[PDB]
Design a protein around this ligand. Sequence first.
Ligand SMILES: *[C@@H]1O[C@H](CO)[C@@H](O[C@@H]2O[C@H](CO)[C@@H](O[C@@H]3O[C@H](CO)[C@@H](O)[C@H](O)[C@@H]3O)[C@H](O)[C@H]2NC(C)=O)[C@H](O)[C@H]1NC(C)=O
Ligand SMILES: *[C@@H]1O[C@H](CO)[C@@H](O[C@@H]2O[C@H](CO)[C@@H](O)[C@H](O)[C@H]2NC(C)=O)[C@H](O)[C@H]1NC(C)=O
Lengths: 148, 215
Amino acid sequence: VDSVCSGTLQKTEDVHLMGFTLSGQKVADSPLEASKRWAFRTGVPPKNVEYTEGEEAKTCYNISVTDPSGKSLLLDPPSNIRDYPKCKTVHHIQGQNPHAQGIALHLWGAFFLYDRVASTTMYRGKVFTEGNIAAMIVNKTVHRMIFS
Amino acid sequence: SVLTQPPSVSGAPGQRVTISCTGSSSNIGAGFDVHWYQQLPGTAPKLLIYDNNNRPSGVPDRFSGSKSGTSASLAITGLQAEDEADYYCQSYDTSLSGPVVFGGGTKLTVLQPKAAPSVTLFPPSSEELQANKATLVCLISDFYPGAVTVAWKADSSPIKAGVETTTPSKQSNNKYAASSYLSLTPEQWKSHRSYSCQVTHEGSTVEKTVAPTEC
Ligand SMILES: *[C@@H]1O[C@H](CO)[C@@H](O[C@@H]2O[C@H](CO)[C@@H](O[C@@H]3O[C@H](CO)[C@@H](O)[C@H](O)[C@@H]3O)[C@H](O)[C@H]2NC(C)=O)[C@H](O)[C@H]1NC(C)=O
Ligand SMILES: *[C@@H]1O[C@H](CO)[C@@H](O[C@@H]2O[C@H](CO)[C@@H](O)[C@H](O)[C@H]2NC(C)=O)[C@H](O)[C@H]1NC(C)=O
């Protein structure tokens, strides 16, 4: 129904934020292609946001990037950053950048997805996949049937 | 070994030959370039093909590279005998296996005709004999294929004892070479009239002989 009143939210638990991948959006995810969407920049503070469920990822990345001196250009992961839950193929990459400064920011405005945490930046050594999230109401009964 | 290559590939001269290299999603399938190396027997690898299909100056137009899907291949047109070597494929890797990955390696064998061995047998050195030791040096090289039988016989009676024989190994001309040593005491060398080392290749047996002749 198109009405504002259509829909019921009984507990906060029934708000579900789902992470959908860019691979699921038929976007090229090869490491060489994927990296063309990532870029370094200063003056931007990385932000993180919690979500509840996510799509099984086609591909993920486990990346460490430094400057020539060996100092990471990627931020150390916060306590609450865990490797993405379900990746079919992880791309482990470790290297250095000759002339880059700041932090890794996704170009499309998409998020770096980890385990129930989306971010505007790439965390060093943590498994992630690219994606976006969407909010919806799912009651427990509906939730129980899907996941079981 | 992570990238898979043909254990062995052959071909006649003037022929077009192909050497494959297929990996996983990580090494090639991910989109990473493929590099090829040439290794002549006993030497260090040479950059043959880089960035999938490019030739560094010093490489013939006879050589060409190609990539499609999870595979990459090397093409040789106008196959020369010079080309007989060991071939290796390279690709960046995103798997647990490290960034740089090599293939298993390929024995490229360009056709050779049958070649009878050149056998030279030397009697124990007089200097060596002074040390109370005595060895006979049987040397057969320039032959193909790499397979020979060595027989040692005091006079007319063969004896399979004191024998140290090598495995054939090809030379720069891609023909094999093998050496055999017979360890005797100087008195055994003296006791018999003559010693004979005979090598059997292609149904034809070469029987050189030596004897205790001081001069
Ligand atoms: C994602 O990639 C990172 C590397 O970029 C992997 O992290 C590595 O985790 C292992 C195990 O925790 C670390 O090994 C140990 O390191 C300590 C020193 O910190 C050393 O004393 C031990 O002997 C051992 O080698 C490794 O250092 C660490 N690397 C970094 C740069 O943090 C991570 O495991 C990858 N994730 C997955 C799911 O594979
Ligand atoms: C949402 O998905 C669309 C569709 O792919 C993305 O659009 C791409 O945006 C980039 C950057 O502007 C362009 O280079 C591509 O050509 C666009 N794709 C298409 C098919 O038009 C959009 O950027 C995505 N945004 C988020 C937040 O995920």
